[PDB]
Amino acid sequence: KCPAVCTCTKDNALCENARSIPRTVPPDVISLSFVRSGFTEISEGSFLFTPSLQLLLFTSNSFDVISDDAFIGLPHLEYLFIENNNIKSISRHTFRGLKSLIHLSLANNNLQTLPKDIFKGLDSLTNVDLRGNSFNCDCKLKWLVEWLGHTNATVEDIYCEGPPEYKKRKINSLSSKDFDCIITEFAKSQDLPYQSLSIDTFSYLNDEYVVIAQPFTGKCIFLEWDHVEKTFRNYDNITGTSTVVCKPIVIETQLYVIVAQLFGGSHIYKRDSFANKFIKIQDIEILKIRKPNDIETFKIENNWYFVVADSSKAGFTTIYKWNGNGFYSHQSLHAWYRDTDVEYLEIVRTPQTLRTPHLILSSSSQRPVIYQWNKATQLFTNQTDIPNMEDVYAVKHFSVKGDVYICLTRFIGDSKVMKWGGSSFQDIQRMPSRGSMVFQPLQINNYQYAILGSDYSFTQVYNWDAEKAKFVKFQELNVQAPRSFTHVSINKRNFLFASSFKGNTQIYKHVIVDL
């Protein structure tokens, strides 16, 4: 009562060069083995009518696929060894239906992949052997990493054979780092009917509000999250002529907004307590501040300051200290220069360990210059220029771990990222771009992006690579004339605003994908 292809003793069966699986075994057969059989594939739902099996092994065979539920009908199956074969892929529910399985070995058959949670359903498992296979390590072997540390069953060590970047590395020794298995995408949730220039946000009573500077019609737009079936809605306007920058400041639960124009442009507002109407407080002199370009807000040592980038040679860059009632002139910088941008950044200047506030302002034809804060005189004293780059329009800053880097913008040429050393800035990455009016890094949930706009071609968005220590090309955005990019964080919802000078401005939604 034993097939002629197989050599069979009373309780054991050894089959070689079998074309198809015989489904009829002697009742007292316990163990079964297949060696170099001519099987194309395992039979779908095979090994029924033979429940007496306890041990089953396959060696030196050739399999393209092992179908799901291939081992159903084996309630007494305990040991299973499929090794020393050549297999490409198996299906996940293959081992499903075997709760009596204890020992399993897929070793040395040169497997490059395994489907997520292949081992579910085997709760009696004790020993598993996967050694001797070429392991290409990606998100599949990430779930595998999840399973190795969580299973009480013992598993001998296995090693990554791919990618060549990760060679001869223990799969047991891997963490969540260097696995960006999550995909991030930016898709436009909303398009706004108006062309924009600058955007900034502020938080009041758990409500987040966003300010937009519309230059031509002169509208300083204040919008809010409607929270009722609406993504964004404009709730208030401030009307001025040739508005450039609308920067809000909140000091001690009080809302103040600075608007800048080129004629009678210096203005400081404060919101009315009742009806949320904005009321103008101060008018800074027209004669001293002419043709403003950029405005940055910064607070230093329990004191709020305020800086305006004067784009005119006649006017000077000015910092304003704030007493109880309003802003008044504190210091002036860079006389008889055309200042394109100003930036505030706190860096660690050696040998000193704490951070020191610093200012970086860029001119038209001039190299950017840096000012070091001096506490004793309440001034910025040490003034140095960063060498070997010209025609820098804007400089932005970001910090990764304990290092602080800067992104320097160039309209035509190499906009480049630099590392802050102990004394000066060090070259990190050179990135060519055309028509770039902005190079803005953004930090969103431990993800450092860097957006480089273009008034001519696509806006190039870059992502941070942790172990490559530089940015990498990430995505391409279609915005007419980008000028500023702003990160907006709602309750568990993340958005980005993209300015458009010659076209309608865009609102993108940040989405996170789990694969």
């Binding site: 230059p215 031509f216 002169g218 002529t241 040739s242 124009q261 080129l262 004629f263 002419r290 043709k291 370009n293 004067d310 784009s311 005119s312 040679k313 006649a314 006017g315 008889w336 055309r338 200042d339 394109t340 038209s364 034809s365």
Partner: protein, 484 residues
């Protein structure tokens, strides 16, 4: 109409050594860069002032810096005009300097106001900058040379407005957002400058560019017998005449004031009338398609009767000086006011200052002293008021006249409120350094004369280029021959 004619500025640019070194110490780079600056400034002037700027000559100093450059743009302007007057012999309507050094001043450049078509005042000085930036600087310097002013009573009060709120105008202070358009008041100030007989030499249309020829640009170069503003705008004038920048046999004139339906003008037909008593009206030669180069009366000719004497086609009197300094509503005071003020030697009337002392004015130099005007406003139309205003009331036989004056500052040594040089104090008299002097002390000349004691034989008018414009019934260089 003098406004409707599209004028042409013959510009010569001189690049110093610092500018040459910022341009890779290379001749081609400096040349192309300056050409581009002139290109942008000309793109501005073309739409605004109906005036083209053509660059016909350029010289760059790669050997050494010729003179002593200064951080003050005014000193650099003076010294540069000294270099032009003593060295530069090339013919041009204006000569500007492109300097690589930085000026420590509120201004990006300096140029003499209304100095166009002068040898001494015909220049300008601009500092280094980006392309569009130095295009603006050259635009406002040439605006100074062409008679445009930035400040005025109308602009200070608000009547003259720049209506670009996102960028200033050219005469205003320049920021990173650069101006593209003038105010209408600047336009009308230019038009008033031209209606006064100023800027005569700007009607010469350049036929030789120093760059390779191009068809369809509006200028006739070598290899082409005719040119149009553009193939699209040709249709207005010269579309019957010129195709592919070549004329058909029936036509020799593409376009111009003297060309009508592809025919020249009859000789002696008037293209442009005289704009004042200093200008001479020009007639079509019947040879060229453009009207004859602008020509005005020679210096020393009487204008506005005996009240003024012609300089550069422009009439200089004390009434026009009052109206120019303090606005159109101002009128010159009666002679009693000067005649009385000079004797006292007070602060209100005076003839000059040596060292914190007033000179007792002579009785002949009375009208060369402090300039006085009846109805005076609080602010000067140009420059800024040094000190405070002056008001002396004078009574004669019960008549009361508030004679008023002021000291107006442009340059440290240039002070308005003083009688301008060349202004007549008396018949056959003129004011120089606040003193009445005869005309024979000015070394005057007068075109070849055929008859005795008569300018151009008395049958014609002398020109600024020292050539006789005979009247009717007279021909020749001296106007001697008679032709009825």
């Amino acid at each position: 109409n003098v406004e409707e004619e599209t004028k042409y500025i013959e510009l010569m640019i001189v690049n110093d050594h610092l500018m040459f070194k910022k341009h890779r110490l290379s001749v081609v780079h400096t040349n192309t860069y300056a050409k581009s600056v002139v290109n942008m400034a000309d793109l501005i002037y073309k739409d605004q002032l109906k005036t083209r700027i053509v660059l016909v000559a350029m010289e760059t100093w790669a050997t050494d810096n010729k003179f002593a450059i200064s951080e003050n743009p005014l000193i650099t302007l003076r010294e540069f005009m000294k270099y032009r007057r003593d060295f530069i012999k090339e013919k041009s309507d204006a000569v500007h300097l492109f300097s690589g050094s930085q000026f420590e001043s509120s201004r990006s450049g300096a140029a003499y106001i209304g100095g166009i078509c002068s040898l001494l005042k015909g220049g300008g000085v601009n500092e280094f900058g980006k392309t569009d930036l130095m295009a603006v600087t050259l635009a406002q310097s040439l605006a100074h040379n062409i008679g445009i002013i930035s400040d005025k009573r109308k602009l200070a009060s608000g009547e003259c407005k720049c209506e670009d709120t996102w960028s200033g105008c050219i005469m205003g202070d320049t920021g990173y957002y650069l101006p593209k358009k003038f105010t209408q008041c600047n336009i009308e100030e230019y038009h008033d400058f031209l209606n006064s007989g100023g800027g005569a030499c700007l009607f010469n249309k350049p036929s030789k560019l120093l760059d390779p020829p191009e068809c369809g640009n509006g200028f006739i170069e070598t290899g082409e017998e005719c040119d149009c503003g553009t193939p699209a705008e040709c249709v207005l004038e010269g579309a019957e005449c010129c195709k592919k920048c070549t004329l058909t046999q029936d036509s020799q004139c593409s376009d111009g004031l003297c060309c009508k339906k592809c025919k020249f003008q009859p000789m002696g037909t008037v293209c442009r009338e005289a704009v004042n008593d200093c200008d001479i009206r020009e007639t079509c030669s019947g040879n060229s398609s453009q009207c004859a180069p602008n020509i005005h009366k020679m210096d020393g000719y009487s204008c506005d009767g005996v009240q003024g004497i012609c300089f550069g086609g422009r009439c200089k009197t004390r009434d026009r000086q009052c109206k120019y300094i303090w606005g159109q509503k101002v009128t010159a005071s009666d002679k009693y006011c000067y005649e009385k003020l000079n004797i006292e030697g007070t602060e209100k009337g005076n003839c000059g200052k040596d060292k914190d002392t007033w000179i007792q004015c002579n009785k002949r130099d009375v009208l060369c002293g402090y300039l006085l005007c009846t109805n005076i406003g609080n602010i000067p139309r140009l420059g800024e008021l040094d000190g405070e205003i002056t008001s002396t009331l004078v009574v004669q036989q019960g008549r009361t006249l508030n004679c008023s004056g002021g000291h107006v500052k442009l340059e440290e040594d240039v002070d308005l409120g003083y009688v301008e040089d060349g202004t007549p104090c008396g018949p056959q008299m003129m004011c120089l350094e606040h003193r009445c002097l005869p005309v024979a002390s000015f070394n005057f000349s007068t075109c070849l004369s055929s008859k005795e004691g008569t300018i151009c034989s008395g049958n014609g008018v002398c020109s600024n280029e020292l050539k006789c414009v005979c009247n009717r019934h007279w021909i020749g260089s001296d106007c001697n021959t008679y032709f009825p």
